[PDB]
Amino acid sequence: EWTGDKTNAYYSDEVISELHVGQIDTSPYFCIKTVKANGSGTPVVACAVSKQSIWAPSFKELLDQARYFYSTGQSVRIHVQKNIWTYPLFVNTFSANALVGLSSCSATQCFGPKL
Amino acid sequence: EWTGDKTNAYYSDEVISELHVGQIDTSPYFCIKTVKANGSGTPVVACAVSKQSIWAPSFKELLDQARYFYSTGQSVRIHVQKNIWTYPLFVNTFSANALVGLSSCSATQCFGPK
Amino acid sequence: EWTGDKTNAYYSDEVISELHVGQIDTSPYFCIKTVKANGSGTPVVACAVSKQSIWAPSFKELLDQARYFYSTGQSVRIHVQKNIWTYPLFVNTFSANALVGLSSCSATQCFGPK
Amino acid sequence: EWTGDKTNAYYSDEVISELHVGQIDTSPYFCIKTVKANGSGTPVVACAVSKQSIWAPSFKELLDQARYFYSTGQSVRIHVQKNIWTYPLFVNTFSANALVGLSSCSATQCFGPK
Amino acid sequence: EWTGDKTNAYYSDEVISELHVGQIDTSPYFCIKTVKANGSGTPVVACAVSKQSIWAPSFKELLDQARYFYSTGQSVRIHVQKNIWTYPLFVNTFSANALVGLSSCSATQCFGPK
Ligand SMILES: CC(=O)N[C@@H]1[C@@H](O)[C@H](O[C@@H]2O[C@H](CO)[C@H](O)[C@H](O[C@]3(C(=O)O)C[C@H](O)[C@@H](NC(C)=O)[C@H]([C@H](O)[C@H](O)CO)O3)[C@H]2O)[C@@H](CO)O[C@H]1O
Ligand SMILES: CC(=O)N[C@@H]1[C@@H](O)[C@H](O[C@@H]2O[C@H](CO)[C@H](O)[C@H](O[C@]3(C(=O)O)C[C@H](O)[C@@H](NC(C)=O)[C@H]([C@H](O)[C@H](O)CO)O3)[C@H]2O)[C@@H](CO)O[C@H]1O
Numbered sequence: 001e002w003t004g005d006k007t008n009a010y011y012s013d014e015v016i017s018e019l020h021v022g023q024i025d026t027s028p029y030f031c032i033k034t035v036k037a038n039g040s041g042t043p044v045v046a047c048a049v050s051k052q053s054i055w056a057p058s059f060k061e062l063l064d065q066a067r068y069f070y071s072t073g074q075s076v077r078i079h080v081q082k083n084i085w086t087y088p089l090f091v092n093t094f095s096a097n098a099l100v101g102l103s104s105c106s107a108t109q110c111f112g113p114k115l
Numbered sequence: 116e117w118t119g120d121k122t123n124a125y126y127s128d129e130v131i132s133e134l135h136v137g138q139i140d141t142s143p144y145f146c147i148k149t150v151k152a153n154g155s156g157t158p159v160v161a162c163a164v165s166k167q168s169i170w171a172p173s174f175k176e177l178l179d180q181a182r183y184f185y186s187t188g189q190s191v192r193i194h195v196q197k198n199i200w201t202y203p204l205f206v207n208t209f210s211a212n213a214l215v216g217l218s219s220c221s222a223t224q225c226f227g228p229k
Numbered sequence: 230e231w232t233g234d235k236t237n238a239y240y241s242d243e244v245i246s247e248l249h250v251g252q253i254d255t256s257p258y259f260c261i262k263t264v265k266a267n268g269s270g271t272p273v274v275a276c277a278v279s280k281q282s283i284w285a286p287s288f289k290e291l292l293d294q295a296r297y298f299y300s301t302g303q304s305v306r307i308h309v310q311k312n313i314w315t316y317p318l319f320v321n322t323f324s325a326n327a328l329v330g331l332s333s334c335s336a337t338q339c340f341g342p343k
Numbered sequence: 344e345w346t347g348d349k350t351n352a353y354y355s356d357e358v359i360s361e362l363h364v365g366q367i368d369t370s371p372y373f374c375i376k377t378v379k380a381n382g383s384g385t386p387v388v389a390c391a392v393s394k395q396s397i398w399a400p401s402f403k404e405l406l407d408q409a410r411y412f413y414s415t416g417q418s419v420r421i422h423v424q425k426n427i428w429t430y431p432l433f434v435n436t437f438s439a440n441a442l443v444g445l446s447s448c449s450a451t452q453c454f455g456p457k
Numbered sequence: 458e459w460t461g462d463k464t465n466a467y468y469s470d471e472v473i474s475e476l477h478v479g480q481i482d483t484s485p486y487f488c489i490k491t492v493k494a495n496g497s498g499t500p501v502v503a504c505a506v507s508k509q510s511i512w513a514p515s516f517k518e519l520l521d522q523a524r525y526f527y528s529t530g531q532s533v534r535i536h537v538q539k540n541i542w543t544y545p546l547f548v549n550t551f552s553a554n555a556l557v558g559l560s561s562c563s564a565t566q567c568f569g570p571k
């Protein structure tokens with residue numbers, strides 16, 4: 001598996017606009033909400049859950065990176081794998097998207113996998 | 116168990132106004148006090164205890180998040196579970212609320228269970 | 230044991246004015262000096278020593294919190310247990326006080342055990 | 344092995360312009376892009392993969408330092424080992440360079456091996 | 458062993474002006490350069506190596522503290538043990554000094570052994 005796998009999904013020029021920390025089924029988790037820098041579209045929501053899913057090893061790394069990018073409000077590319085979380089109230093509040101990577105962006109290029 | 120469970124309680128549009136760190140019964144713990152951003156209402160106090168309660172796994176993440184929101188003074192939704200802590204002097208100093216979640220807010224809308 | 234035990238000692242309305250990090254007897258440690266925010270009185274000195282004393286579990290949490298309160302210069306209540314460190318040269322340089330808690334203080338109160 | 348081994352490659356007077364965090368084959372990884380502070384030349388790209396290669400022990404140290412230098416935009420020397428990473432799409436997206444060191448460069452010569 | 462042992466050396470009224478991170482012989486390490494705040498004297502260089510020397514246990518604490526004092530520019534007392542590191546190209550790039558302590562300095566005092 002890789003953040004950049006073609007079967008994952010990514011969204012460019014997003015601003016991390018909200019951040020939530022909680023616990024579910026023995027695991028600390030966090031979720032982020034992102035919106036397009038230009039105000040268009042619908043928000044993207046993605047979560048990472050400690051010790052759950054194949055992405056568990058990167059939980060702390062992604063939490064720390066999401067915190068930083070949230071604090072600056074810079075435009076980023078968010079990478080997700082869809083349809084990972086299944087707890088239904090959790091998905092309804094947040095989403096089933098697993099956060100799998102974050103990339104900084106210049107105005108012309110995001111520094112991370114694409115296509 | 117989940118932060119968003121109906122059996123928990125939450126308070127929106129709150130600012131973390133005080134922070135305390137200590138140890139009890141070999142466990143580090145911290146407590147926060149929050150107040151409504153507009154100054155109305157009654158303070159909310161909640162604590163997390165590293166080795167105690169079902170919420171023990173989230174101690175470090177909530178400590179780090181509480182510290183961040185404390186440092187910025189931004190408006191948050193604080194999620195607690197009532198009647199968790201039982202040592203009377205501790206409860207009387209702070210409260211029996213376990214801290215179970217923290218959500219950011221933009222204006223009057225917060226990003227978290229409700 | 231608890232930060233708030235009556236057999237501990239605390240000092241309110243203090244500012245963390247100095248910070249030292251070192252190692253002793255295989256243990257990283259840190260010490261802080263605090264002084265009254267209003268300039269009166271004599272300093273308080275306390276140390277936390279990584280794998281030493283009953284307070285060892287909270288070493289990292291207290292170091293992180295001391296660094297934060299040091300960086301802001303805000304008024305705090307420092308909680309100590311007296312007569313813990315026994316190495317006389319270490320005590321004479323710093324003190325025998327173990328650091329056991331830190332509480333933010335407003336103009337009117339401190340958020341922690343009294 | 345050593346960051347400073349002459350078989351490695353380094354670039355002085357750079358700034359960290361981009362940062363990426365992800366996971367591959369159960370390992371956290373990060374990559375950085377650097378460019379000459381003065382705008383000349385071409386970018387340098389390097390990655391660290393937490394579970395992989397002799398450099399694995401320094402993953403967190405390098406990630407933390409990369410984040411700090413990225414946050415400030417200060418001049419740095421970046422040290423890499425060429426021709427390490429193998430997965431073709433990963434290499435094409437980023438590079439085959441392993442990040443093996445970072446040096447501040449706030450004076451005449453960067454503070455690192457040359 | 459103790460930071461304050463007379464067999465160590467220290468330098469007051471210094472400011473951390475450079476920081477480097479790397480790895481050698483599977484061990485993460487960092488080095489700092491300090492200069493006198495008033496511009497006099499000769500720079501002090503010291504390194505910590507994560508699993509080498511009797512000072513190995515304090516590696517992370519001193520890296521974190523070095524980073525803190527580097528970022529604030531404040532005047533410090535740096536404590537070293539001389540003649541510890543031995544790899545010649547490393548020693549000639551940096552120095553043989555092990556970093557063993559960091560103490561904040563006001564303007565007439567430093568808070569640490571002397
Ligand atoms: C670039 C182009 O074809 N037309 C431009 C452009 O402004 C715009 O298209 C969108 O603009 C940028 C350019 O990359 C976006 O990056 C969109 O590409 C991606 C993305 O990286 O964000 C690709 C990605 O694979 C897509 N993810 C998924 C799951 O499908 C996303 C996603 O569709 C969008 O981010 C959702 O908003 O887009 C690119 O589509 C168009 C229309 O605005 O008009 C021209 O100006
Ligand atoms: C000061 C007071 O008593 N107010 C309530 C009144 O606000 C309440 O309905 C309110 O409806 C709005 C709709 O925008 C919000 O949903 C308020 O939500 C919460 C909150 O998010 O803060 C919900 C939460 O469940 C409540 N927490 C608990 C433990 O009950 C809090 C909480 O009451 C306040 O935060 C305390 O200051 O409010 C919601 O308050 C109606 C309900 O009868 O009338 C008043 O009682």
Ligand SMILES: CC(=O)N[C@@H]1[C@@H](O)[C@H](O[C@@H]2O[C@H](CO)[C@H](O)[C@H](O[C@]3(C(=O)O)C[C@H](O)[C@@H](NC(C)=O)[C@H]([C@H](O)[C@H](O)CO)O3)[C@H]2O)[C@@H](CO)O[C@H]1O
Nearest residue numbers: 139140144164166167168169198199200201202203205206
């Ligand atoms: C009085 C009663 O009815 N108790 C029952 C009993 O089944 C059980 O009591 C709790 O569970 C064990 C003992 O079985 C603990 O001794 C609880 O006491 C402490 C603890 O030792 O951990 C005291 C401690 O000071 C508290 N920590 C604080 C205040 O910071 C904790 C803390 O409140 C809890 O750990 C939170 O989960 O408890 C004792 O109260 C409980 C099982 O939950 O159920 C009662 O019906």
Ligand SMILES: CC(=O)N[C@@H]1[C@@H](O)[C@H](O[C@@H]2O[C@H](CO)[C@H](O)[C@H](O[C@]3(C(=O)O)C[C@H](O)[C@@H](NC(C)=O)[C@H]([C@H](O)[C@H](O)CO)O3)[C@H]2O)[C@@H](CO)O[C@H]1O
Nearest residue numbers: 237238239240241242265267269270271306337338339343
């Ligand atoms: C006009 C004026 O400033 N008068 C001060 C007077 O306020 C001050 O009294 C102190 O007021 C603070 C208020 O936060 C506390 O109530 C002090 O009580 C404690 C403390 O909390 O710090 C209680 C504590 O148990 C004591 N600790 C020990 C080991 O005994 C400490 C300790 O004695 C003092 O902190 C040392 O100064 O005090 C209360 O003393 C007094 C004393 O600072 O000085 C007037 O000028």
Ligand SMILES: CC(=O)N[C@@H]1[C@@H](O)[C@H](O[C@@H]2O[C@H](CO)[C@H](O)[C@H](O[C@]3(C(=O)O)C[C@H](O)[C@@H](NC(C)=O)[C@H]([C@H](O)[C@H](O)CO)O3)[C@H]2O)[C@@H](CO)O[C@H]1O
Nearest residue numbers: 351352353354355356357379383384385420451452453457
């Ligand atoms: C050399 C000098 O005193 N003054 C300028 C100078 O602007 C520039 O030369 C560069 O000067 C820097 C600052 O010390 C370095 O010395 C450059 O040498 C290195 C480097 O440290 O960056 C050595 C290194 O071994 C090289 N790495 C590899 C893999 O070969 C790099 C690399 O070639 C460059 O960084 C790529 O741009 O260079 C030194 O090049 C030149 C600019 O033309 O002009 C002098 O007058």
Ligand SMILES: CC(=O)N[C@@H]1[C@@H](O)[C@H](O[C@@H]2O[C@H](CO)[C@H](O)[C@H](O[C@]3(C(=O)O)C[C@H](O)[C@@H](NC(C)=O)[C@H]([C@H](O)[C@H](O)CO)O3)[C@H]2O)[C@@H](CO)O[C@H]1O
Nearest residue numbers: 465466467468469470493495497498499534565566567571
């Ligand atoms: C500091 C400078 O550049 N010039 C001198 C100054 O040396 C001299 O007195 C100095 O005053 C400072 C005040 O903090 C210290 O007391 C200096 O003592 C020490 C130190 O703590 O830095 C003692 C220490 O044991 C010495 N370390 C070693 C390995 O010998 C260091 C060391 O010699 C110096 O730091 C290196 O610069 O000095 C003390 O020397 C005053 C006269 O009082 O005049 C200045 O110009």
